């Protein structure tokens, strides 16, 4: 039985002490968190998702901090370190001045109006980026690969990642909102080397098909996706027992191949040389196709065959008795199975429903593959937010101090009770401008002062704090940039958490 | 320690003090363990059995320590004992007081490496002047008196009271027969206690002495092939079974008839294969016995674990229990098989003589085994003292008279050099001094009365202490010119191995 | 492995050997103040001499065991 | 449990003090020996910067990370792991004072970086391209062994060290994966150590003098059973059916005489005479009545061979494993030029040298079979890993403090990054360099202040790389003493120190988790 301010302050003390070490983990210059296991194990990370899952939390508000980090992780995966930083000082600064005065609902609606004023200010500060220029996309990826500070061959993986996500931009909800990255697929290769690879059309497959079971190479013939009914007929048109007897062998087998050859004649109408079958696939059905001069494929998961259907832009047929070129294998299509290393890798290019290209990476080992991949994993996060919003916001304290001022004149204009949470959120925005001064090592009281002074003149349009040089730098000149969409949802999550724990005054069993 | 890490058992106090303090306490019982002794050490064991002894190698194996500095040095005392005989009493007591002097240099502020290299220069220079302190040699190892002259010091290092009769008797039991030109038995010298016929009636019996009573008649020939078996013969008794006390006694009679004809053929097949003596590590069967008398084959009623393994070594046999009719895979070696009554006990005597392949075994007769198993400890290092592997053993002054002969040289050598190694050479001459200081405190006088004289006599080689009045008041005892000798080699390793141990244990701080 | 040395070890052996000599001091005489000896046996045992009583003692001092073994000899 | 603002940094630096303090006297010939009985509860004699970390039951998380970090250094260098421990706590000492004055750790970490690459710039300046001649290889091998063991033991071992690495230059290999087999001889003195070009077989063929001198060795490294175990089964082990188990017995004795007759056809197949020898190395014991019959045919047949020897004899000499002795040509077998049965101890130790391919060189040490034999085992191991770096680089440098003050002169006096934020980290960086020459000489008796003022003047006077004599306490020139470090070694200790210093400096919470 828990109630009152003590739940509220316990919500404060838990959410604050989480964000303390993790804001030192912020910045490309950061401070690693140390985690001593009781077995003596050591964790030295900055990424809060590995942090929050490893640490032991006893307050369910601290468990809810993981849940809003699970919220940001499942939508993006990045900024999960940053969503918990902003949510601390929202409830740290405003609450105890006002919950000694005890108005929960007013601070909720103050948290409402802190959100939309930030939204318009995002459109004030963000100039649009080119979604038709690689170099406009390049420097923002270069801002992301230097976070882990890996540019061995991640720099050439910048162009591989942008030529995947910009290509796979196709996603509808009635107004074509595209925030997809699952339509892209990386190639996980132990052989070859990264640099003489490039993006290929369609959606490339590495997950199950690693063998030339399709053909060796295909120029003209189409791909066939089969979720249709390929279960053979045991009786005349009946489902009797299967072959387990010589008496069951002679009668039934004549009608077993009879169901299959009708399907095979329907498929040869579009002239393939490759047919993959997933649902209803039988052992006899995929080897009369061997007699029908088509090498047939099974044992593939469904998410492969969503990619393979997007590798050709065709609809997977549920009609068994008629197949067309306008049903499976849209257009001519291309299928290329070549040797990279020792294994023969299936590429499916020439995607009709065009603009579909995926990632081809190949390390000299799997470890050499995996290190470049994580940088390209962060890179495909960024371009997906570029597809989500084609405007770029300056990094550092340029975005934060600009919004931190606009709440103040909003607080002077509205000048109700909500004016006091605005200035509190205005200071809650500055903690990432605060923590970069420890992420560099400079005097924090002077740099926050001069960043206010640059808002007086320059309005902090592109002059924010750098935790790399400790000075208030042009984000145009230094190339520290990020999309508006990743900035908004990071702030949107921190608004959601601050409203959440403000409702929490009782924790009972 | 400031942190959760760093598990260690040594440090600033513990390495300086407690490592040396642990080596002090092990050397504390060895203050009177070499040379003349009034000191005795009762031990109850891990076997929890009452024994008194004066050999530290018996004591230190009963002793356990967690201090690795204290643990390491007793292995080096074994390394001298593996090489030469007695003097394993000396290795601990020399290095023990050596390290106590090293604390005093660490009291002053000397670096440990200055103390490390200081005794090393002193170890080399002493080993140079030490063969110049060779005063005699075993010119005739066939002589009984020249052999007994060496042995009186090592027996004194167990007990002063039995040094003279045993040193003759060991030479009477002939370690003299070895030319020592690569000839030394290590297990065909194995001392055989015969209970009864008290300790001055201890005797001589060359070749392998077996206390076990000779059963049956004597061998057909003394040139017999020796069959050494682990348990060929058995003896029957049983108790209640799974269903109690089995349903008949007919199969008990049926099993008893084949048992006699089994051991009838076992003595027969040994008689057929050429062996005319059987060695039974198990007990004797009655049905086996009365066919062995007609076959004229000598039998041993029982043997222990040590009896078979010496026979598998010396004769060259293989020990296995014969549940089959035995054949000869044992190749009898000894050409003379005797029965003797030693201590009025039927004693199996095997015998052969070769130039560098002879056998000559110590036998002891005493009315108490618990006395005689410590008397053999005076014999154990004394026989290995003959293993210098040379005829002329380069005999040095016995008793410890070489120590004051050395200590005059070393502190003179320590004065001439410069350095901070300079002091540890002078402390090294003090390490010779501590042993006769500890022995004279068992003699019955103070050390400063004694040690003043042995420095004041001169380079002499003769002047030392025993356990007499001449040891006490004048501190002059002819421990060179009265049948008291030591060899060069036992003195050479015991200084060497005590040095390398003490230098090793001084560097460690963990 | 335990050990005790020196004079405080040695005097401890002496007074241990005194107490068993305090017992038998006039047992060759017919007289004294009797001890019937009951052990985990649970049985009544008297004697007229000390040597039978010395066969009954499980000595706890090994130095005092030596004086037993000479006297038993 | 959590560790807050001051305490989380403080436990890390205070543990780095006493870790550096206990591991002080472990580098160079002033470096004293250490024992562990608290790592495994056994009498252990151990010396290395990495190996002492791995044995001690440490619970502080920093020393656990350094045991991981110095492992990457120990894979290349060996010694130098104890060099890395000394400079870390000294580097943490100066920067903590600035934090004790009140300063961000990150601005000092920012000053740790540009200070490092100037020293890395200085390493190309101070590297001395010497030849890889044997006497130049001796001076590296002298200071490597005298770090761990005595100098009298070192110089006997240094003779055996520098010749095997010249043999790996015949294979043109800069590194050492083979010729590193440490074989141990039963002795009582570890004063002796023999070098065999080929291999050392550790056994002696129960009926001796079969063929103890083989000038033409055709090697068969097999494991054929001649003492074959004979079992009667009906269940995979002993069963109750006495009727069934009897019929298998008649074929069990036919296997032993089968393998005896196969040896006779192989000797006439390979040799054809007794002038050319033939050697059988059996991993198992051989029948002595076979060892009598094989000895007359011109065959020596070694038995109970070690399974570790089984692969290495195939690599250098040759000879593959069978369970038969079928007719084989000398192409299927390997060759050795000379076979000699040597005896020391209770076992015969057959020397086998001048292989079909002298690819592996056996380092045979003698010793009293103690931890001293173990202590000379890893000492020559780190002796080989140090001169492994010598074949790697072209520049062998006078070390022992000669570079250390030479860096700190350029770092303090010349600001590389004259902006004051980074020069703060330079001051902690250059003062970190002083710890190796100053305290080992101070341990030798001439204290740290007399040593520093001498070597700073003399190197600024000469430019000749004056080091420090660790046996007097005063600086002497390491070019003539022969206390040298490689260009490969000195970079990594600069590399491994800095990266592990910055991350533990940049923590603020050490939380119990999992």
From Swiss-Prot, chain A:
> Catalytic activity, per the record?
ATP + H2O = ADP + phosphate + H(+)
Q: What Gene Ontology molecular-function terms does this entry list? A: ATP binding; ATP hydrolysis activity; ATP-dependent protein folding chaperone; protein folding chaperone; RNA binding; unfolded protein binding
Transmembrane parts of this sequence: none
Record PTM Phosphothreonine, positions in chain: 415, 444
Question: Superkingdom of the source?
Answer: Eukaryota
* Modification N6-acetyllysine occurs at: 207
Q: What is this protein called?
A: T-complex protein 1 subunit gamma
The enzyme's E.C. designation: 3.6.1.-
Give the binding site residues for ATP.
27, 79-81, 396, 467, 482
> Function of this protein?
Component of the chaperonin-containing T-complex (TRiC), a molecular chaperone complex that assists the folding of actin, tubulin and other proteins upon ATP hydrolysis. The TRiC complex mediates the folding of WRAP53/TCAB1, thereby regulating telomere maintenance. As part of the TRiC complex may play a role in the assembly of BBSome, a complex involved in ciliogenesis regulating transports vesicles to the cilia.
| Residues recorded with modification Phosphoserine | 155, 228-229, 237
- Write out the GO biological process terms: binding of sperm to zona pellucida; chaperone mediated protein folding independent of cofactor; chaperone-mediated protein folding; positive regulation of protein localization to Cajal body; positive regulation of telomerase RNA localization to Cajal body; positive regulation of telomere maintenance via telomerase; protein folding; protein stabilization
Record-annotated disulphide pairs: 351-357
The question of whether Protein biosynthesis is a record keyword is answered with no
Cross-link Glycyl lysine isopeptide (Lys-Gly) (interchain with G-Cter in SUMO2) residue location(s): 233-234, 366
Q: Where does ADP bind?
A: 27, 79-82, 147-148, 396, 467-468, 482, 487
State where Mg(2+) binds. Answer: 78
In the record, the note on similarity to other proteins reads: Belongs to the TCP-1 chaperonin family.
Main location group? cytoplasm
Keyword Nucleotide-binding part of the UniProt annotation: yes
Q: Which Gene3D superfamilies match?
A: GroEL, GroEL-like equatorial domain, TCP-1-like chaperonin intermediate domain
Post-translational modification Phosphotyrosine, affected residues = 232
UniProtKB/Swiss-Prot annotation, chain B:
Q: Which GO terms describe its molecular function?
A: ATP binding; ATP hydrolysis activity; ATP-dependent protein folding chaperone; cadherin binding; protein folding chaperone; unfolded protein binding
Q: Which residues carry this modification: Phosphotyrosine?
A: 17, 492
Q: Which reaction does it catalyse?
A: ATP + H2O = ADP + phosphate + H(+)
Q: Which CDD domains does the entry link to?
A: TCP1_theta
Keyword annotations: Acetylation, ATP-binding, Cell projection, Chaperone, Cilium, Cytoplasm, Cytoskeleton, Hydrolase, Isopeptide bond, Nucleotide-binding, Phosphoprotein, Ubl conjugation
Q: What is its EC number?
A: 3.6.1.-
Residues engaged in binding ADP: 34-35, 87-90, 156-158, 399, 486
Can you list the GO cellular component terms from the UniProt entry? azurophil granule lumen; cell body; centrosome; chaperonin-containing T-complex; cilium; cytoplasm; cytosol; extracellular exosome
Q: Has the keyword rRNA processing been applied to this entry? A: no
Q: Cross-link Glycyl lysine isopeptide (Lys-Gly) (interchain with G-Cter in SUMO2), residue numbers?
A: 211, 241, 247
| Top-level taxon of the source organism | Eukaryota
Cellular location(s) = Cytoplasm; Cytoplasm, Cytoskeleton, Microtubule organizing center, Centrosome; Cytoplasm, Cytoskeleton, Cilium basal body
N6-acetyllysine: residues carrying this PTM: 305, 387, 453
Q: Where does ATP bind?
A: 87-89, 157-158, 399, 486, 491
Any GO BP annotation:
protein stabilization
Residues bearing PTM Phosphoserine: 10, 149, 200, 256, 304
Residues involved in crosslink (Glycyl lysine isopeptide (Lys-Gly) (interchain with G-Cter in SUMO1))?
446
Q: Binding residues for Mg(2+), per the UniProt record?
A: 86
Disulfide linkages recorded for this protein, renumbered to the chain, are none
Q: Which NCBIfam families match?
A: chap_CCT_theta (TIGR02346)
Tell me the protein family, please. Belongs to the TCP-1 chaperonin family.
Share what the entry says about its subunit structure, partners included: Component of the chaperonin-containing T-complex (TRiC), a hexadecamer composed of two identical back-to-back stacked rings enclosing a protein folding chamber. Each ring is made up of eight different subunits: TCP1/CCT1, CCT2, CCT3, CCT4, CCT5, CCT6A/CCT6, CCT7, CCT8. Interacts with PACRG. Interacts with DNAAF4. Interacts with synaptic plasticity regulator PANTS.
- Mind telling me what this protein is named? T-complex protein 1 subunit theta
Gene name, Swiss-Prot/TrEMBL = CCT8
Curated annotation (Swiss-Prot), chain C:
* Compartment(s) of residence: Cytoplasm
Q: Which residues bind ATP?
A: 29
Tell me the residues on which N6-acetyllysine occurs.
Answer: 55
- Taxonomy, superkingdom: Eukaryota
Q: Which residues bind ADP?
A: 29
Quaternary structure (record) = Component of the chaperonin-containing T-complex (TRiC), a hexadecamer composed of two identical back-to-back stacked rings enclosing a protein folding chamber. Each ring is made up of eight different subunits: TCP1/CCT1, CCT2, CCT3, CCT4, CCT5, CCT6A/CCT6, CCT7, CCT8. Interacts with PACRG. Interacts with DLEC1.
Q: Which disease is it linked to?
A: De novo genetic variants in nearly every subunit of the TRiC complex, including CCT7, have been found in individuals with a broad spectrum of brain malformations, and clinical phenotypes ranging from mild to severe epilepsy, developmental delay, intellectual disability, ataxia, and other features of cerebral malfunction.
Q: What does this protein do?
A: Component of the chaperonin-containing T-complex (TRiC), a molecular chaperone complex that assists the folding of actin, tubulin and other proteins upon ATP hydrolysis. The TRiC complex mediates the folding of WRAP53/TCAB1, thereby regulating telomere maintenance.
Tell me its family. Belongs to the TCP-1 chaperonin family.
Protein name (Swiss-Prot/TrEMBL): T-complex protein 1 subunit eta
Gene name, per UniProt, is CCT7
Covered range of the whole protein: 13 to 85 of 543
Swiss-Prot record, chain D:
Primary location group: cytoplasm
What GO molecular-function term can you cite, just one?
Answer: RNA binding
Instruction: Note one Pfam family from the annotation.
Output: Cpn60_TCP1
- Per the UniProt entry, the Enzyme Commission number(s) are 3.6.1.-
Query: Reaction(s) catalyzed by this protein?
Result: ATP + H2O = ADP + phosphate + H(+)
State its location(s): Cytoplasm
Coiled coil regions, renumbered to chain: none
Chain positions with Phosphoserine modification: 194
Q: Which GO terms describe its cellular component?
A: chaperonin-containing T-complex; cytoplasm; cytosol; extracellular exosome; microtubule
Q: Which residues carry this modification: N6-acetyllysine?
A: 188, 276, 354, 366, 377
User: GO terms for biological process?
Assistant: chaperone mediated protein folding independent of cofactor; chaperone-mediated protein folding; positive regulation of establishment of protein localization to telomere; positive regulation of protein localization to Cajal body; positive regulation of telomerase RNA localization to Cajal body; positive regulation of telomere maintenance via telomerase; protein folding; protein stabilization
Gene3D superfamilies, per this entry?
Answer: GroEL, GroEL-like equatorial domain, TCP-1-like chaperonin intermediate domain
Binding residue positions for ADP: 28, 80-83, 147-148, 400, 485
Cross-link Glycyl lysine isopeptide (Lys-Gly) (interchain with G-Cter in SUMO2) placement: 240
Q: Where does ATP bind?
A: 28, 80-82, 400-401, 485, 490
Instruction: Alphabetically list the UniProt keywords.
Output: Acetylation, ATP-binding, Chaperone, Cytoplasm, Hydrolase, Isopeptide bond, Nucleotide-binding, Phosphoprotein, Ubl conjugation
At the top level, the lineage of the source is: Eukaryota
Chain residues that bind Mg(2+): 79
Give the protein's function: Component of the chaperonin-containing T-complex (TRiC), a molecular chaperone complex that assists the folding of actin, tubulin and other proteins upon ATP hydrolysis. The TRiC complex mediates the folding of WRAP53/TCAB1, thereby regulating telomere maintenance.
Tell me its family: Belongs to the TCP-1 chaperonin family.
**Protein name, please?**
T-complex protein 1 subunit zeta
Species name: Homo sapiens
């Amino acid at each position: 039985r828990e109630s009152g301010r003590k739940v509220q302050s316990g919500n404060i003390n838990a959410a604050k002490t989480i964000a303390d070490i993790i804001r030192t983990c912020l910045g490309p210059k950061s401070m690693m968190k140390m985690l001593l296991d009781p077995m003596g194990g050591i964790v030295m990370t900055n990424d809060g998702n590995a942090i929050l899952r490893e640490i032991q939390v006893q307050h369910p508000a601290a468990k809810s901090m993981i849940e809003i980090s699970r919220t940001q992780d499942e939508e993006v995966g990045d900024g999960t370190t940053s969503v918990i930083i902003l949510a601390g000082e929202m409830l740290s600064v405003a609450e105890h001045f006002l919950e000694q005065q005890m108005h929960p609902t007013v601070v909720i609606s103050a948290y409402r109006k802190a959100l939309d004023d930030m939204i318009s200010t995002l459109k004030k500060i963000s100039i649009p980026v080119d979604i038709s220029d690689s170099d406009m996309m390049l420097n923002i990826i270069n801002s992301s690969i230097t976070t882990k500070a890996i540019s061995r061959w991640s720099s050439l993986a910048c162009n591989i990642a942008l030529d995947a996500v910009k290509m796979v931009q196709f996603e509808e909800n009635g107004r074509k909102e595209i925030d997809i990255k699952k339509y892209a697929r990386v190639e996980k290769i132990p052989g070859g080397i990264i640099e003489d690879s490039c993006v290929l059309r369609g959606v490339m497959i590495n997950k199950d098909v690693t063998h030339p079971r399709m053909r060796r190479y295909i120029k003209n013939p189409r791909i066939v996706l089969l979720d249709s009914s390929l279960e053979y007929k045991k009786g005349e048109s009946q489902t009797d027992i299967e072959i387990t007897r010589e008496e069951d062998f002679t009668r039934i087998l004549q009608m077993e191949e009879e169901y299959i050859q009708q399907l095979c004649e329907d498929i040869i109408q579009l002239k393939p040389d490759v047919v993959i079958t997933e649902k209803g696939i039988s052992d006899l059905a995929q080897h009369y196709l061997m007699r029908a001069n088509i090498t047939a494929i099974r044992r593939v998961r469904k998410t492969d065959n969503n990619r393979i259907a997007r590798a050709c832009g065709a609809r997977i047929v549920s009609r068994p008795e008629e197949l067309r070129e306008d049903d499976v294998g849209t257009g001519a299509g291309l299928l290329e199975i070549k040797k990279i290393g020792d294994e023969y890798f299936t590429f499916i290019t020439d995607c009709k429903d065009p603009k579909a290209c995926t990632i081809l990476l190949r390390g000299a080992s799997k470890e050499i593959l995996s290190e470049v991949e994580r940088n390209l994993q962060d890179a495909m996060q960024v371009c997906r937010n570029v597809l989500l919003d084609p405007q770029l916001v300056p990094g550092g304290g340029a975005s934060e101090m600009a919004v931190a001022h606009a709440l103040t004149e909003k607080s002077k204009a509205m000048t109700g009770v909500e004016q006091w949470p605005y200035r509190a959120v205005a200071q809650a925005l500055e903690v990432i401008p605060r923590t970069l001064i420890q992420n560099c090592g400079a005097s924090t009281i002077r740099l926050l002062t001069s960043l206010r002074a640059k808002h007086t003149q320059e309005n902090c349009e592109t002059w924010g704090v750098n935790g790399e040089t400790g000075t208030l730098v042009d984000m145009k000149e230094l190339g520290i940039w990020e999309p508006l969409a990743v900035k908004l949802q990071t702030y949107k999550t921190a608004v959601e958490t601050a409203v959440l724990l403000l409702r929490i005054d009782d924790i009972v069993s | 320690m400031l942190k959760e890490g760093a598990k260690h058992f040594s440090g600033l106090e513990e390495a300086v003090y407690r490592n040396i303090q642990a080596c002090k306490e092990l050397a504390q019982t060895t203050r009177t363990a070499y040379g003349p002794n009034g000191m005795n050490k009762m031990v109850i064991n891990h076997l929890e059995k009452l024994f008194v002894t004066n050999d530290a190698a018996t004591i230190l194996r009963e002793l356990e320590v967690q201090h690795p500095a204290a643990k390491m040095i007793v292995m080096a005392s074994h390394m001298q004992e593996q090489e030469v005989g007695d003097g394993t009493n000396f290795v601990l007591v020399f290095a023990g007081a050596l390290l106590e002097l090293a604390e005093e240099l660490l009291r002053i502020g000397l670096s440990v490496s200055e103390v490390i290299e200081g005794y090393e220069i002193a170890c080399r220079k002493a080993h140079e002047i030490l063969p110049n302190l060779v005063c005699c040699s075993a010119k005739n190892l066939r002589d009984i008196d020249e052999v007994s002259s060496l042995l009186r010091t090592s027996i004194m290092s167990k007990q002063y009271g039995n040094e003279v009769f045993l040193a003759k008797l060991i030479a009477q039991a002939c370690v003299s027969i070895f030319p020592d030109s690569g000839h030394f038995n290590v297990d065909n010298i194995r001392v055989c206690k015969i209970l009864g016929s008290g300790i001055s009636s201890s005797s001589v019996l060359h070749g392998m002495v077996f206390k076990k009573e000779t059963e049956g008649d004597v061998t057909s020939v003394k040139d017999a092939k020796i069959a050494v078996y682990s348990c060929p013969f058995d003896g029957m008794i049983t108790e209640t079974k799974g269903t109690v006390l089995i349903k008949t006694a007919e199969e008990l009679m049926n099993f008893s008839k084949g048992e006699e004809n089994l051991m009838d053929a076992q003595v027969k097949a040994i008689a057929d294969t050429g062996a005319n003596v059987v060695v039974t590590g198990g007990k004797v069967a009655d049905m086996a016995l009365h066919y062995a008398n007609k076959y004229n084959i000598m039998l041993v009623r029982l043997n222990s674990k040590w009896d078979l393994r010496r026979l598998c070594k010396t004769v060259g046999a293989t020990a296995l229990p014969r549940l089959t009719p035995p054949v000869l895979e044992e190749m009898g070696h000894c050409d003379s098989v005797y029965l003797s009554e030693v201590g009025d006990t039927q004693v199996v005597v095997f015998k052969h003589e070769k130039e560098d392949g002879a056998i000559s075994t110590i036998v002891l007769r005493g009315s108490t085994d618990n006395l005689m198993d410590d008397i053999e400890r005076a014999v154990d290092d004394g026989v290995n003292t003959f293993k210098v592997l040379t005829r002329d053993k380069r005999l040095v002054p016995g008793g410890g008279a070489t120590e004051i002969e050395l200590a005059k040289q070393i502190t003179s050598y320590g004065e001439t050099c410069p350095g901070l190694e300079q002091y540890a050479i002078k402390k090294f001459a003090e390490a010779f001094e501590a042993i006769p200081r500890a022995l004279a405190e068992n003699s019955g006088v103070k050390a400063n009365e004694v040690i003043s004289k042995l420095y004041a006599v001169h380079q002499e080689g003769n002047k030392n202490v025993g356990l007499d009045i001449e040891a006490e008041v004048p501190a002059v005892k002819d421990m060179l010119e009265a049948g008291i000798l030591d060899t060069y080699l036992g003195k050479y390793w015991a200084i060497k191995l005590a040095t390398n141990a003490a230098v090793t244990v001084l560097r460690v701080d963990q | 492995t335990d050990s005790s040395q020196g004079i405080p070890q040695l005097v401890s052996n002496i007074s241990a050997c005194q107490v068993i000599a305090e017992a038998v001091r006039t047992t060759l005489g017919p007289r004294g103040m009797d001890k019937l000896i009951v052990d985990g046996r649970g049985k009544a045992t008297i004697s007229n001499d000390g040597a039978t009583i010395l066969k009954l003692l499980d000595v706890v001092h090994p130095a005092a065991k030596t004086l037993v073994d000479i006297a038993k000899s | 449990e959590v560790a807050r603002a001051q305490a989380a940094l403080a436990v890390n630096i205070s543990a780095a003090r006493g870790l550096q303090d206990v591991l002080r006297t472990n580098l160079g010939p002033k470096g004293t020996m250490k024992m562990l009985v608290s790592g495994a509860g056994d009498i252990k004699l151990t010396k290395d910067g990495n190996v002492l970390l791995h044995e001690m039951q440490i619970q502080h998380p920093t020393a656990s990370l350094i045991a991981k970090v110095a492992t990457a250094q120990d894979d290349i260098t060996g010694d130098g792991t104890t060099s890395n421990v000394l400079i870390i706590g000294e580097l943490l000492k100066q920067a903590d004072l600035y934090i004790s004055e009140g300063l961000h750790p990150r601005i000092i970490t920012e000053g740790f970086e540009a200070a490092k690459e100037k020293a890395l710039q200085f390493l190309e300046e101070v590297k001395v391209s010497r030849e890889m001649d044997r006497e130049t290889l001796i001076d590296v091998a002298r200071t490597s062994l005298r770090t761990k063991v005595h100098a009298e033991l070192a110089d006997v071992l240094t003779e055996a060290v520098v010749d095997s690495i010249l043999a790996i230059k015949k294979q043109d290999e800069p590194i050492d994966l083979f010729m590193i087999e440490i074989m141990e001889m039963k002795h009582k003195s570890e004063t002796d150590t023999s070098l065999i070009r080929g291999l050392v077989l550790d056994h002696g063929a129960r009926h001796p003098d079969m063929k103890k001198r083989v000038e033409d060795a055709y090697i068969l490294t097999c494991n054929v059973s001649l003492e074959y175990e004979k079992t009667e089964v009906n269940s995979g082990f002993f069963y109750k059916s006495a009727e069934e188990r009897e019929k298998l017995v008649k074929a069990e004795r036919k296997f032993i005489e089968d393998r005896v007759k196969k040896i006779i056809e192989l000797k006439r197949k390979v040799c054809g005479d007794s002038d050319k020898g033939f050697v059988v190395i059996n991993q198992k014991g051989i029948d002595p009545f076979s060892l009598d019959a094989l000895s007359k045919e011109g065959i020596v047949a070694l038995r109970r061979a070690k399974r570790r020897n089984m692969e290495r004899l195939t690599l250098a000499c040759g000879g593959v494993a069978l369970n038969s002795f079928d007719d084989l040509s000398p192409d299927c077998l390997g060759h050795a030029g000379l076979v000699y049965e040597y005896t020391l101890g209770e076992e015969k130790f057959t020397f086998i040298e001048k292989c079909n391919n002298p690819r592996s060189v056996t380092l045979l040490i003698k010793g009293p079979n103690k931890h001293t034999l173990t202590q000379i085992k890893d000492a020559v191991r780190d002796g080989l890993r140090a001169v492994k770096n010598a074949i790697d680089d072209g520049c062998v440098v006078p070390g022992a403090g000669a570079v250390e003050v030479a860096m700190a002169e350029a770092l303090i006096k010349h600001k590389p990054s004259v902006k004051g934020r980074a020069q703060l980290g330079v001051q902690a960086f250059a003062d970190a360099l002083l710890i190796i020459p100053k305290v080992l000489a101070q341990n030798s008796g001439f204290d740290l202040q007399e040593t520093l003022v001498k070597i700073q003047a003399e190197h600024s006077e000469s430019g000749q790389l004056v080091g420090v004599d660790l046996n007097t306490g005063e600086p002497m020139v390491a070019a003539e003493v022969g206390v040298w470090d490689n260009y490969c070694v000195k970079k990594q200790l600069l590399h491994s120190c800095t990266v592990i210093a910055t991350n533990i400096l940049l923590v603020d919470e050490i939380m119990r988790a999992g």
